[PDB]
């Protein structure tokens, strides 16, 4: 049974990419419009970093201790390697998206039942010649909606 | 007379050039005089960094005095409550915080 | 047809706010409005505003001499709504 | 043959856009229109536009004095198309 | 022999484009044309262009008093062609 | 009277030097006056970056006013809308995006 | 028995985050208000480093031997990996803290019996796709109170 | 049977270099003119990366989140290790190409039936002294036409 | 009049300063005039890098015009064809290629 | 039988250094003048690198694709380790060459039958004190002649 | 008249400013003239690097001509056999090699 509060092994973890027009965050749970990527070998999602800005002051009553605040948080870079397939329409769309090069939205779904949506642009297309695999990575832009917002 | 209670970032600079009556001769013996009574007047270079919300407030306060009105200010940890006027300030608006670089010239009442 | 949106715009102290500017940014192409088109409206001294708004999807944007463009939200005009105030559209269930 | 496109362009608040200009860029070479060619026209003071566009696939751009050039969308005029306003081609199913 | 290529070139709005300049860029050595040689032609105010082009492989370039060379494509003239318009070669099945 | 709506890149600079009538006496007593009524007029340094397609559009708009016409422009987040004129601008065209550097000098009506 | 003067394996090592208002340094021994985090995989605590400043002088009677003093000591960065728990309110609060971005206080408890309290802001949020875990790193600000200051 | 929609081990993966004149992109399926290289020990294909340009603005409606776009995408570097064959004509042609140094086009063929074509110049030549192998590295120039562009 | 078909390396700047008539007053109200009809005249900095073999050829061309003869040129992109003169070309011969860093000034007929 | 077009294990791989006066490239096949180095443990020949010069242009039809050409190719660095043996005149002359420091020519032979000739100057001399061995590396200068140029 | 056959290190710099007669009118119409018959004379910046042994020989040869006598010198690959004079040269003496950095100003007969 798919439900949170228990850990999940993560067998399925599907990956979908948007094709239509609308608001991706309006309802990510419906897969009526998005196209799935098939037989991904491995995946590494991006990490949400931040930036540290100085806060120390002359008249600050506590000295001998640095003071730093947080600002300008940024999304990370997503990467995944799958089986190189020049036949399926998904990889065709992926390479057309890279060549034309526009920001697009996509999502990852977990066996637990919650979905994560990012938006960004792709920046690399790798290859290997021993059991042919294609490695592709994208860089995100703007705010991604984490899976912990839909649960509320 | 208003005051200046904003905090100041590290790196504030202090300059001091007291006024003397130099006059040069053959082999030294350069006679020296203290010139005026309060000859020296420290000049401060002050850097601040505030989020954009109150940048307008700080700018309005500095504009209200212009470059002709004095206001009390206490240099950090220094034993004097000096009166200072400013005529040069700039701000670097980037995305979230804006840093002000200003110069403060000391003046007697 | 354009629904007539009229009302009085006030701040948090029950007072009119002057030097305002209300605009609607078009987000989706409609039957009669092109995407990425803005229309400005400046209210009176008493905060009274009145516009004739065509049906479709808009983003209401409230620009005051001060705070940057304020995103009260996105508003939607189907062909069943009745004339009223803009705050109803902001507070309406989407 | 070229199809006639006539209409009036307005904004969300039901007002005409002034000092505007519509530009069409040919993204595909055709038997009568060369690729990467732009045709431009400015509406009147009342926002009325009327122009005879050739068949093919075009990108439509709206220009206003001061604003960055906005990319309204892409239109396709076939040989079975009928006269209408420019908005209908934008909202047509693709 | 030189095949006759004549016609009128119009933009996507069905209006003749002025201040035009069409260039032919040879890509290969032919019977009477040396590689890396350019040939220029400036049409009239009505958009009428008229050339006597030799046979071989060319690349077409379009400049409008500040348009970058618009590589509409490569044309090939072989020894059965008949006189026509320039856009025909661009639209011809290669 | 046209207006300005092109968005501005981070790092924009602003400078302000209020014109004052400074005269120093024997021992301090420096008489200061505000000089002109609206003496404080800011000067902005603004940089943009646009793809080459609208470089012509921006250049044509900047050419229309020349260096003798004023246009209304609302600085980011600032309250009062001002009218400004410019007389210097430069650009770097690399391959796809051209970056523009200019200075906007605030002027009264 | 939890009591110092004998070393401890450190098996439990609970982690708590403050939620209320007041002085976290007043009495960290009371867990009336703080919220516990569940199933911490691994944890690395902060590093209280300092900075070195020059102290060499010309007229010193001992030469050819450098002399540096200590100043401006700063706290380090804490990191911990949890089982991805979207249902639990703790992770929801943690992500809300990251998004809104203020300085918050937290503590780590030991089976020895004493606790350690830090304060700072989070800076990195990471994830994995095989037995999903969430990796979260925070940076401290200001002087912390060690366990020793409580034992006296 | 060579066709897509099922993954391929990739055992054959022949390597060809253009010799004649014309358009290599016109018909890479025809091996009428290209010369084959024999006994490839190992191969690593190019990595089509891109570059990122800033897109943040003063008046952006979403602050504290970095934004960037892609521009000026570039092809990678190809490398392959061969058995040192000083007699076979292909290696002589390759070294003459390196010595004279002009841009040349080449291709790699997969057992699935599709072909991938690059163009560039060679930048490195290496050797070994135990089971002698020669390592050749080339850098591409201009846009390559991938297999996907042919599959449509 | 000849043309200039040589290609330009990325890095060109299009610095431009129009000519206006300034006259300053206390609280501004400075009048402005467009001065001459052709107020603006762009000034480009053209960078090239050619293999040494044909370098001399380009030199001869720039020698033929000297600094007194104008030649037509089309700046990359921009809906204009202009006539330019150059007087400050310079070259850096290193091993195989030579880079020229010349300056081009717009002039009306 | 030593002949090309088939791989060779590389057992002998002798190393010779010029001593006389003349043209090393005139005929390297004759060992009538050069001295052989004895019991080389391992050898790494230099690699013929290149250098990439920018070719991207403004008015070119192709954008968003970097263009780079080749220029100023250079030879690599050769290294080899022998059994430290000051008795033989070979490394005696090698060390005298290092101390006096002039450019000199040398060759590597193969069981295949072809010879490679290089010219350069030595830049290091090493040692070990467990089964004592001397490691020496040189940097080449000017054009070397590869074995392929001789096979034609 | 002696010659100059010493090798030249890569990175030689070339400068050329033709002397022209510029005069500008209301709207352009700028009269331009070539001034002298042979106006532009290139000036080279040349650096050498030689071991110390013949640094004395190079210094003596450069001393012989002083700063007034001219000497023929062929620029690398350049189609002309020009005559040049120099009046400034410097050297960075090290324990193995010394590098000279001089300027060569072209003059006619």
UniProtKB/Swiss-Prot annotation, chains A, G, H, J:
GO BP annotations, alphabetical order: symbiont genome ejection through host cell envelope, long flexible tail mechanism; viral tail assembly
Compartments reported by the entry: Virion; Host cytoplasm
GO cellular component, one term: virus tail, tube
Disulfide bonds: none
Keywords of the record: Host cytoplasm, Viral genome ejection through host cell envelope, Viral long flexible tail ejection system, Viral penetration into host cytoplasm, Viral release from host cell, Viral tail assembly, Viral tail protein, Viral tail tube protein, Virion, Virus entry into host cell
The protein's role, per its UniProt record: Forms the phage's tail tube composed of 32 hexameric disks. When it encounters the appropriate initiation complex gpM and gpL, it assembles in hexameric rings that stack on top of each others. Multimerization ceases when the correct tail length is achieved through a mechanism dependent on tail terminator protein.
Subunit structure, interactors included: Multimerizes into a structure formed by 32 hexameric rings stacked on phage baseplate gpM and gpL. Does not multimerize in solution without the tail initiation complex. Soluble major tail protein interacts with tail assembly protein GT during tail assembly.
Name under which the protein is recorded: Tail tube protein
Organism: Escherichia phage lambda
Curated annotation (Swiss-Prot), chains B, F, I, K:
Main location: virion
Superkingdom as given in the UniProt entry: Viruses
Cellular compartments per GO CC: host cell cytoplasm; virus tail
Record-linked InterPro entries: Phage_lambda_TipM
Keywords in alphabetical order: Host cytoplasm, Late protein, Viral genome ejection through host cell envelope, Viral long flexible tail ejection system, Viral penetration into host cytoplasm, Viral release from host cell, Viral tail assembly, Viral tail protein, Virion, Virus entry into host cell
Location of this chain's protein in the cell: Virion; Host cytoplasm
Family matches, as Pfam families: Phage_min_tail (PF05939)
Gene Ontology terms: biological process: symbiont genome ejection through host cell envelope, long flexible tail mechanism; viral tail assembly
Function: Part of the distal tail tip which plays a role in DNA ejection during entry, and in tail assembly initiation during exit. May bind tail tip complex associated with tape measure protein and allow tail tube protein polymerization on top of tail tip.
Similarity field: Belongs to the lambda-like tail tip protein M family.
Protein name stated in the entry: Tail tip protein M
UniProt source species: Escherichia phage lambda (Bacteriophage lambda)
UniProtKB/Swiss-Prot annotation, chains C, D, E:
Signal peptide: none
UniProt-recorded name of the protein: Tail fiber protein
Span within the parent record: 1 to 94 of 774
Organism: Escherichia phage lambda (Bacteriophage lambda)
Transmembrane segments: none
Family: Belongs to the tail fiber family.
Taxonomic path: Viruses, Duplodnaviria, Heunggongvirae, Uroviricota, Caudoviricetes
Subunit relationships: Interacts with Tail fiber assembly protein.
Taxonomic superkingdom: Viruses
Function statement: Forms tail fibers that play a role in primary attachment of virion to host receptors. Assembles with Tail fiber assembly protein to form fibers attached to virion tail tip. Fibers are about 35nm long and have a thin, uniform diameter. There are presumaby six fibers per virion. They bind in a reversible manner to host molecules, attaching transiently the virion to the host until tail tip interacts with LamB and injects viral DNA into the cell.
Gene designation per UniProt: stf
Compartments, record wording: Virion
């Amino acid at each position: 049974v798919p439900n949170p509060t228990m850990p999940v092994k993560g067998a399925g973890t599907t990956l979908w990419v948007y094709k239509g027009s609308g608001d991706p965050y309006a309802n990510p749970l419906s897969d009526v419009d998005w196209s799935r990527l098939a037989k991904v070998k491995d995946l590494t999602p991006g990490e949400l970093t931040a930036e540290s800005y100085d806060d120390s002051y002359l008249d600050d009553e506590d000295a001998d201790w640095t003071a730093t605040g947080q600002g300008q948080k940024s999304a990370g870079d997503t990467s995944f390697t799958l089986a190189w397939m020049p036949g399926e329409q998904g990889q065709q769309a992926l390479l057309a998206w890279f060549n034309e090069g526009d920001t697009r939205a996509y999502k990852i779904r977990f066996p637990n039942g919650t979905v994560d949506v990012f938006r960004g642009w792709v920046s690399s297309i790798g290859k290997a010649v021993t059991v042919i695999t294609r490695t592709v990575k994208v860089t995100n832009v703007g705010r991604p909606s984490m899976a912990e917002d839909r649960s509320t | 007379m208003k005051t200046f209670r904003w905090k100041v970032k590290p790196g504030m600079d202090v300059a001091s050039v007291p006024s003397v009556r130099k006059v040069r001769f053959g082999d030294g013996y350069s006679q020296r005089a203290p010139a005026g009574l309060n000859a020296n007047l420290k000049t401060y270079s002050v850097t601040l960094s505030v989020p954009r919300e109150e940048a307008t407030v700080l700018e309005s306060f500095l504009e209200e005095h212009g470059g002709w009105k004095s206001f009390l200010w206490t240099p950090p940890y220094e034993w004097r409550q000096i009166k200072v006027t400013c005529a040069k300030w700039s701000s670097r608006v980037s995305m979230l915080r804006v840093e002000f670089s200003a110069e403060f010239e000391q003046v007697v009442n | 047809m354009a629904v007539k949106i009229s009302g009085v715009l006030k701040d948090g102290t029950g007072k009119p706010v002057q030097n305002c500017t209300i605009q609607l940014k078009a987000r989706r192409n409609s039957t009669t409005v092109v995407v990425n088109t803005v229309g400005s409206e400046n209210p009176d001294e008493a905060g009274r505003y009145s516009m004739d708004v065509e049906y479709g999807q808009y983003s209401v944007i409230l620009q005051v001499d001060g705070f940057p463009p304020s995103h009260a939200g996105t508003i939607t005009v189907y062909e069943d709504s009745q004339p009223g105030t803009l705050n109803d559209f902001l507070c309406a269930m989407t």
